[PDB]
Every structure is written in structure tokens, then in C-alpha cells.
Amino acid sequence: ITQGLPRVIELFEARRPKAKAVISEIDGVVRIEETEEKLSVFVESEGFSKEYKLPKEARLLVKDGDYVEAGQPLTRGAIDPHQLLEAKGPEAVERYLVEEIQKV
Numbered sequence: 001i002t003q004g005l006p007r008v009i010e011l012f013e014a015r016r017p018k019a020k021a022v023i024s025e026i027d028g029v030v031r032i033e034e035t036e037e038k039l040s041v042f043v044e045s046e047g048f049s050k051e052y053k054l055p056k057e058a059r060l061l062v063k064d065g066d067y068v069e070a071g072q073p074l075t076r077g078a079i080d081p082h083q084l085l086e087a088k089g090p091e092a093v094e095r096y097l098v099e100e101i102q103k104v
Contacts, residue, residue, distance in 0.1 A: 001078065004104060011101050014081050021077035022052050025087050030066045030074075041074055 001019060002010060010017060028043040028050060041062065043050035052074060059076040062068060071088030073079060078100075085093045 007078075008101060008104050010078075011081075011097055014097075016080045016082065017078035019077045020080050021073045022054055022058070022075040023071050023073050023079060023083055023087055024050065024052075024068045026050055026070045028068060030062045030064055030068060032060075032062075032064045043068060 002017070022041075024043045026043060026045060026048060028045040028048065031042040031044050033040045033042060037056065038053075039056045039058070040051060040053045041060070043052070054075060060074060061076060062074050068074070069088075071084050071092060079096060081093055081097065084096055
């Protein structure tokens, strides 16, 4: 994560954060799949399937069987503003940038 001026610069430059969070591209229900060595999270829609293979030590913000919005974070960390843009649209990005800059 990042605090202070570097976080501000990272936001104003719209950089992809180093320790970025993972977000859902679509809406759907959470289905966790965890081997003792490997980890993956599945966003299952009524007719679609999404699969996010994340490193095994990543903190989750999603309880199993939850309905997540497109663009909603699954992992902790800073959100990549461009991914948030493609997933959720302009308004969500403006909101995110303003609030995130204001936190500092």
C-alpha cells in the first residue's frame, strides 16, 4: 500500500499500483476454490463464468456465495483506475479518485 505524497502522485498520474487489488469484471456470485497450495476465486453469473487466479496469501474481501458488483474489489489493496474504468465506468472512477486523494 501507499500513504502520503507518493499515493497522491500515483492517483493523479493514474498509475497501476504495485500491490493492486483484484476486481470483478462482471456481476455474479462468489465461489471460492482453495487448494492447500493454490487459490482461485470464481465470479459465477446466471449464464457466465469468471475466474481470477490470485496468489495464495492475498486477503479476501469476499465471503463465499456473495453477490458482487462489476468493479467490486475481491482482494485488498489499491484499485487500478483503468480497470475500474472498463468495469464500472466514468462516474465510479471520478468518485474513486476524489475520495482516494482526499483520504491522504
